[PDB]
């Protein structure tokens, strides 16, 4: 059975409170007289339940392509010579913080599988990191573009049939990283399904190796995937919606989405998501938890967002002294979802501590 | 084990013969008086072993969107608009034949692998095909962007281990669609390596279904999927590149490339099938991406291929062109379609062993190993 050997994050170094970015945004967009607009927004970064976010886009980064800042600018270009080249260099960094926690070297890998959503390429973003990280080249490549935020856990259910199917030598690594590079619009007050991103979208890595049939005596697993199904919410298709422009991609968010979309691993899409589940099923507060860490301390990452989550409850299980990598329980999910509308459920098994 | 248990294919309607395409290609795009560049294409053409092509992109569509026309003009936003909706449409004329070749019902479907490097939109191209064939909402859906020309190949792969690890009930429906709206440019002088593209990219759509564990009742394999690798070729990083831009994708081709992959892909043949025993290179099949003729007669030059070999590659360049992602798809069909309609003994032009290469940027090789069925 297919288990996840090692996982690890990065993220931008750029610190971003939510605090101060009402400030920030309008202030770099050069929309400061819109301030009915920026009343809104300072609401909705307040309700966003997010203390942090890590961002590439700097104001530097904006004066360095100012039509990014610039709402209905051509900017595709600047944007897409930005995230072919700093997706890739990302994911590189927490791919190599989870090969370490492995324990084996690149020569063990057999597969990768990289997911975005920020920036196309061709050769893509997985050839490009198996280039500067040094990937050999028998290692066997798949690459999952624009599939959003259930880019992770779908990610773990390809993993999982190719783990099985081809034995005890096959070793995934999984990596996925996105940079709101990709989608970042400056205000307007008829385009408020743009706006509520920009107070909760933000970027990250994360990596995971996955393989089955373990050397026990060097390979440790701290999730075993049950099983994996992906389902598609009927007559939802504008829930979520990303169109790739020459102004960058506008990606619509709905107001619907939270009403229409055991340890728990929930894609922390925001904060009304989070909590839809925890009163729908009576769960304890403790259940969500570190679904809700992810959110407070990194925002919604989009596809990395749930092995973000995945690693902070093994490391708290852990440093709690917790029965189990799932906080002392033996079975979990982790749901993905977006675009379609689009839910991956990952059943999942923790390992004991 | 994974079997192709259906084949089909579509095309846009619009048949552009390459003998006329010079003309055509410089009257649209308002480039006539770049006579000599006009004069370079002729040849490229004229050496291209293409004799038509399926295209979407009429003069009528340009006149529709005339920046897809003008040179560094914008035009990503038009391009997009097309092809969201289009790609998953043609995608629907091919799965619908395919089904029906399997026999079926949609419900009897668990999986969906769409691939094309023609567009791209959330949700993507797997998620309308669903739609607008009116799938049932368990179907499993898969996408693959931008992986160029090993995208049909690279489905075959992926759906392999879907199949066999998921066992009996699973379907897969692979959709592979390309359409060079995402990339045609009118010509340039200093551009060379974007008006090969011009000579040689082309338009089509193909479908197939893929399960282990077959009701031998209802289901008959045309090609068993016995195994398949992915390898990607040090030091080739410039040798096929695509860079989505304002005006579309900038698709550049290296002079060297067909001569790197046909030397690469010889060699994997050698490393691949010596092992299984294949005697000597004329007892096997071969499907090899037509990604220009060149690719073609290295494979016969360097294995000694007879002339019956490489036919149905050199069949498909020729009424086709080079459709990218479900290429590898169309030579599969007109293998079997052949062996059938000729009194072979097997799907595989009766022999028992074959190959099937896709290839692109990378440089990437995908090698599938395939056994036929008898017939
Ligand atoms: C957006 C969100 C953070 C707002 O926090 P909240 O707990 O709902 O609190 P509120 O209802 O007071 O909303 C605060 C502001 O945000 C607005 N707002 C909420 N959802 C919105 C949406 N989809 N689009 C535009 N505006 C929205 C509200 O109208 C309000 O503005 P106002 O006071 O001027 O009327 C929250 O609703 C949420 O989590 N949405 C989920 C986002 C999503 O769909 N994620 C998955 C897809 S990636
Ligand atoms: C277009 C094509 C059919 C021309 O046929 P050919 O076998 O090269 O015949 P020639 O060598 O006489 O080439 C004719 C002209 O095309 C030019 N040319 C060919 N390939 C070129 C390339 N990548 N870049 C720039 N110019 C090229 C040659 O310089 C030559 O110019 P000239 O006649 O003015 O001297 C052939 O080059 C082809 O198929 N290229 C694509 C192969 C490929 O890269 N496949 C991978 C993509 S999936």
Known sequence: QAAVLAIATANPPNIFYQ??????????????????????????????????????????????????????????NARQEIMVEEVPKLGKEAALKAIKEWGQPLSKLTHLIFCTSSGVNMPSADYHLAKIMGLPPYVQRTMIYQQGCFAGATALRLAKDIAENNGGHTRILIVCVELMVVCFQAPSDTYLDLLVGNAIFSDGAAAAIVGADLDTTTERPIFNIVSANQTTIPDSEDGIVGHIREMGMKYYLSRTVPQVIMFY????????????????????????????????????????????????????????????????????????????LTVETVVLRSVAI
């Open 265 to 340: 691993i929930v894609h922390p899409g925001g904060p009304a998501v989070l909590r839809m589940m925890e009163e729908k099923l009576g769960l304890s507060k403790e259940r969500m938890r570190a679904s809700w860490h992810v959110l407070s301390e990194y925002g919604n990452m989009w596809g990395p967002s749930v092995l973000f989550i995945l690693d902070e409850m093994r490391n708290k299980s852990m440093e709690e002294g917790k029965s189990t990598t799932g906080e002392g329980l033996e079975w979990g999910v982790m749901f993905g979802f977006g675009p379609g």
């Open 19 to 76: 605090a101060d970015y009402p400030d920030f945004y309008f202030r770099v967009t050069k929309s400061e007289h819109m301030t009915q607009l920026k009343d809104k927004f300072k609401r909705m970064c307040e309700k966003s339940m997010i203390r942090k976010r890590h961002m590439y886009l700097t104001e530097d980064v904006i004066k360095e392509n100012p039509n990014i800042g610039i709402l209905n600018a051509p900017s595709f």
